[PDB]
């Protein structure tokens, strides 16, 4: 579970526990409009290639990125948020 940057619990971090940096395949940062109402996302896979589309302004979405994994994705979670003052929809 993830926490907020205003008033969190005692744990403050529950994503991973590994100390050493593991081998990765893709790690990037993107920017989005802060003064926005809704954020639209389109994730899918085809022939072992994972495609992702993102949009912050407007209803239609635009291409964001695409990578190669070689396997078949099975499950997905939401990582519930734990905060002290907060409304939150997904």
């Amino acid at each position: 579970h993830t926490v907020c940057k205003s008033k969190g619990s005692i744990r403050n971090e529950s994503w991973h526990i590994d100390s050493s940096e593991p081998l990765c395949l893709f790690k990037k940062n993107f920017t989005y409009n802060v003064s926005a109402d809704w954020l639209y996302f389109h994730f899918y896979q085809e022939r072992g290639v994972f495609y992702a589309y993102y949009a912050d302004v407007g209803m239609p979405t635009t291409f964001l990125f695409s990578l190669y994994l070689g396997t078949i994705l099975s499950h997905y979670y939401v990582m519930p948020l734990t905060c002290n003052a907060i409304t939150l929809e997904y």
């Binding site: 022939r47 072992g48 290639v49 070689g70 396997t71 078949i72």
Partner: protein, 33 residues
């Protein structure tokens, strides 16, 4: 979860019971296991 796949999963008498199903590799994929 816990478990017959006996005696072998390749030459099993009842393939509908063992969870290790027989599948083929598609396009742009690897051997599942």
């Amino acid at each position: 979860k816990y478990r017959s796949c006996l005696p072998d999963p390749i030459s099993t008498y009842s393939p509908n019971t063992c969870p290790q199903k027989k599948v083929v590799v598609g396009i742009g994929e690897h051997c599942p296991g």
